[PDB]
């Protein structure tokens with residue numbers, strides 16, 4: 001029955017509400033090595049709900065909360081990740097959701113605060129979002145107990161690996177140098193995550209270097225060949241990311 005789930009999401013997106021709604025008062029606040037942990041029953045599982053520190057990005061010195069959240073997702077202790085998303089500010093919240101899907105980690109998106117999005121004249125299309133993200137999207141109003149118990153626990157029991165859908169289309173030189181960096185990293189890290197990490201290093205992420213072994217030292221040489229192939233490598237990563245995120249927001253969002 002054991003199943004470890006990690007709630008992940010932006011700050012002020014109804015994360016603690018959803019955590020509390022599922023856990024109730026079956027919680028244990030301790031400390032990493034604040035670590036918040038909870039328990040709740042499903043049909044097929046008894047879940048260990050690991051609350052993670054709220055963050056906008058798995059990349060960036062910043063606070064200690066940001067790092068532990070990032071490291072936990074890479075650690076791979078969790079079977080499933082439930083990503084609490086604010087529906088009223090989708091674009092802003094999707095950047096973390098993209099990173100989780102780029103890491104290839106099985107996850108369910110808890111699309112929350114839909115009533116606020118509805119009040120702001122925004123009707124998000126659930127099936128369209130699920131199709132383009134490649135993971136179950138559960139519409140929610142976390143504050144309503146009637147709504148939270150509707151399907152979420154049902155979705156948790158039938159979870160699978162994400163659909164291998166196309167997300168960000170980076171230029172080939174970026175994928176080349178990210179792959180070269182990925183070959184230097186320890187092989188126990190999945191190849192799909194090693195390439196993503198390599199790309200974060202090129203953009204100038206401070207965290208990703210930790211999982212790279214000695215690949216972090218080969219950065220400037222890769223950046224040199226990138227800087228002669230394009231004006232700036234870090235920007236081109238950020239450009240391609242935007243069109244992906246923005247293209248999802250367009251086809252998924254509508255007038256109520």
Ligand SMILES: Nc1nc2c(ncn2[C@@H]2O[C@H](COP(=O)(O)OP(N)(=O)O)[C@@H](O)[C@H]2O)c(=O)[nH]1
Pocket residue numbers: 010011012013014015016017018054112113114115116140141142143
């Ligand atoms: N209207 C609405 N409000 C919500 C919903 N979920 C959470 N909230 C409200 O948003 C605020 C922040 O919620 P919280 O869970 O603390 O977010 P956090 N800090 O990311 O854990 C709270 O005042 C809460 O009542 C929702 O689905 N709909």
